[PDB]
Ligand binder design. Structure first.
Ligand SMILES: C[C@H](CC(=O)O)N[C@H](O)C(=O)O
Ligand SMILES: C[C@H](CC(=O)O)N[C@H](O)C(=O)O
Ligand SMILES: [Fe+2]
Ligand SMILES: [Fe+2]
Lengths: 294, 294
């Protein structure tokens, strides 16, 4: 039966032993969620699930949403997003090498979900794991002059930099794809900071991957140097990943990571050698919107 | 033996009967070239050539250059550019539906060639042919206030709007392809008008497909409205193709079109129904650069 072992103090993370999604109680689920919101990353140990079972687990936490671009979808379970460089029967399943940039999931969408679940299937032996930054904690550690500068500002977020070419795009003019991206997923505006609706923390909601501009309360665009200074101060421009804000989360076979997609940004690791790597993802809406202004 | 029948007066075009590239004399070649430079489009009749023979024909006119992106190249004759929606043994040969925008060939490159050759292989029965505008004649017919406005200006030309996605681009982030385009083929600058080095005509060297900006002699960028007014006045924004400058060039099996790639812009026709369409192209440098300032 479910036992949660939280990292001590303000250290990030929690290990969850004995969890079985099909027989966990309501109270088990609420406590797991409480751990996600407070410790940001919960690592479920010893999970051996089929794709259908992984979805059922995610459904225990909230309402799953399928990724809007179908080439990412698992062929049997639409709601599973697949990152994979391992062909199955010669077919490309999902998309290779996803998320190799700092971001929060669906940050470029009007209605981001609160919880992301990763179930690694094939794990590389070398550059293994995912980097994370707690942007609530990163906000708190900002120089107080930077905190005042971004007071009352809004940021615009867009998928335009990392949108991946799809198979049916081959031979099409590049400008036609760029236009389609801007039509289907126009840039969305959020307050630069917001109150986490479960914990009350102030979250700095920006990422190098998706945040493309910042403006003041009157709508006046601000020099993008302000964004670059915020990326720099929070650790997102440190290509050595030694910055104090950066947490490297590793995992072993059977681990399943569940994390706070409001508070955290993350980034896949780049591998210097070609290794098989397959991960399944489910993304779920919980009982509140991203912040209570949505 | 070669007989050239020129359209009368200032009407565009010439029919060339009895031409065989392997036994044509030097004088035949010089006269064909003279017809290209003065009548802009020469239609060689009754040509039945293999890919190797088509290249040899082009070599009679000048130095062929292979297209810089290899996916366009014929699998046996590298110097042949292939536009095709007809698979050969299940393989895509060349690129489907090329050139569906106003342009001059290689206008986005530092050193454009003077002569383009098209050898249609599979010809649609419906929307057949290629549109052309003589930009020397289009310059002459400009309102004289527009002629003064563009005096001494330079234009920048770029492939960035119609660069076609390549097979190995699938699953790559769109921004990485955009960056590669700007690195390999940065925008090139030309005088807005130049003197045709064979005929002495003044050519207005712009196209809706490739011309992305205009600036004065001091390098000061000008409102892009000036380019839009030049496109409008020369017939490039008329989506009905009824404008006085536009010439529709049709062809039948065995026709081979050779044209003045300094003076002319052109545009493939859009088909409303899916029909097989295959064309081979060779592009050749003649005895002068695009203009004598290169
Ligand atoms: C662009 C990214 C996919 C990718 O990196 O290929 N989407 C995010 O994963 C998301 O859920 O917001
Ligand atoms: C972009 C275009 C190819 C295409 O339309 O796919 N290149 C031109 O044909 C040229 O030779 O300048
Ligand atoms: Fe992600
Ligand atoms: Fe062309």
């Amino acid at each position: 039966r479910m036992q949660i072992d939280e990292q001590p103090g303000n250290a990030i993370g929690a290990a969850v032993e004995g969890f079985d999604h099909a027989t966990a109680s309501d109270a088990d689920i609420d406590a797991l969620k409480s751990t996600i919101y407070t410790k940001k990353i919960a690592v479920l140990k010893g999970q051996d699930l089929s794709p259908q079972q992984f979805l059922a687990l995610g459904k225990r936490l909230g309402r799953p949403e399928a990724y809007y671009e179908p080439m990412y979808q698992h062929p049997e379970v639409t709601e599973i997003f697949v990152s994979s460089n391992v062909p199955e029967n010669g077919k490309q399943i999902g998309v290779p090498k996803t998320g190799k940039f700092w971001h929060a999931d669906y940050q470029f969408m009007p209605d981001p979900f609160g919880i992301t679940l990763i179930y690694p299937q094939v794990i590389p032996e070398k550059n293994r794991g995912t980097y994370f930054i707690d942007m609530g904690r990163a906000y708190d550690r900002l120089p107080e002059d930077l905190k005042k500068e971004i007071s009352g500002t809004y940021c615009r977020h867009s998928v335009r930099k990392y949108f991946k070419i799809r198979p049916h795009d081959v031979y099409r003019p590049i400008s036609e794809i760029i236009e389609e991206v801007e039509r289907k997923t126009p840039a969305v505006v959020q307050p630069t900071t917001f109150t986490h609706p479960m914990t009350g923390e102030t979250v700095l909601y920006i990422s190098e991957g998706f945040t493309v501009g910042i403006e003041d309360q009157d709508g006046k665009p601000l020099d993008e140097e302000l964004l670059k200074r915020l990326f720099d101060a929070t650790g997102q421009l440190d290509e050595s990943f030694e910055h104090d804000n950066i947490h490297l989360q590793s995992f072993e076979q059977g681990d399943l990571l569940v994390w706070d997609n409001r508070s955290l940004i993350h980034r896949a690791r780049h591998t210097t050698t070609p290794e098989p790597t397959v991960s399944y993802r489910v993304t779920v809406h919980d009982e509140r919107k991203l912040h209570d202004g949505i």
